From a paper:
Using the new variant sample, we also solved one AEP-dCTP-Mn2+ ternary complex structure. The dCTP was captured at the active site of the protein, coordinating tightly with the Mn2+ ions. The A-site Mn2+ coordinates with the non-bridging oxygen atoms from all three phosphate groups, whereas the B-site Mn2+ only coordinates with the α-phosphate group of dCTP. Besides Mn2+ ions, the phosphate groups of dCTP also form H-bond interactions with the side chains of His157 and Tyr221. Binding of dCTP has no obvious impacts on Asp97, Asp99, His157, Asp200 and Tyr221, but it leads to an approximately 100° rotation of the side chain of Tyr83. The Leu21-Val37 region folds into one helix (α2) in the apo-form AEP structure, but it is disordered in the binary and ternary structures of the AEP domain. Superposition shows that the overall folding of the AEP domains is similar in our AEP-dNTP-Mn2+ structure and the HsPrimPol-DNA-dATP complex. Likely, due to the lack of pairing with the template nucleotide, the nucleobase of dCTP in our structure is different from dATP in the HsPrimPol complex; however, the triphosphate groups adopt similar conformations in the two structures. Conservation in catalytic residues, cation-coordination and dNTP binding suggests that C962R may follow a conserved two-cation-assisted mechanism in dNTP incorporation as other primase family proteins.
Author numbering: 47 to 60, 64 to 272
Amino acid sequence: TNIINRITGKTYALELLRFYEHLEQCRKQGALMYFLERQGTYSGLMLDYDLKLNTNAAPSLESSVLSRLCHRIFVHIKNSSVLPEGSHKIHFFFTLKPEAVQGKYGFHVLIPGLKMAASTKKSIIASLQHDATVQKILHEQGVANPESCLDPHSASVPSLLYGSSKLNHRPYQLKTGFELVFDSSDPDYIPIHQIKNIESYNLVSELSLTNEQGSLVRPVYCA
Ligand SMILES: Nc1ccn([C@H]2C[C@H](O)[C@@H](COP(=O)(O)OP(=O)(O)OP(=O)(O)O)O2)c(=O)n1
Ligand SMILES: [Mn+2]
Ligand SMILES: [Mn+2]
Ligand SMILES: [Mn+2]
């Protein structure tokens, strides 16, 4: 799937890949969009980090720091006990607010390929509240609300498609994406590597929580 055009209010019930191909062409043509996808009850995981900052400068959110956030976020994903057996590639996408505005920053962690129930998403969001490392990481980034920056409604709110924004806001920009391989044959091995050539893919398509036809992002279905 369900797509909402915030600017027109029109909602669609999708053809999804062809839709995303058009949006990507619109996105690379700098078009102003306000498209959201409804997460529904079974789709990819999105984390909505609403950051209060100590300074008016955007946090550096370096790859090493974002990679550590991936590991911590995946730990809570793994701890949901919904992941399937075997070796699976899961992708973490960090879309960042373009600039800090009045000490308010934000980034989205997109795990679009990890299809899970909304209850599983909420349980992972709730589990993340107890992550002292995520809090320490964000605190060291200049975040003033590291214990309360993860929006508890991340599992519920419609997710802006990549390149789309809210009414008077700028669209979040993908800083980087990480490829995570989790193998039941080696649970302690969590290789998190930056995705090579993320820009060669349809970012609207790949980052969509409801998409199941992505090329880079292949659905991994949770229980
Ligand atoms: N009027 C609207 C429009 C969209 N959403 C959805 C779209 C985002 O994907 C999600 C995240 O919640 P935010 O309100 O924080 O949206 P952003 O993260 O994009 O904005 P900000 O940078 O201010 O945090 O909520 C919303 O809650 N309210
Ligand atoms: Mn937000
Ligand atoms: Mn809890
Ligand atoms: Mn929010």
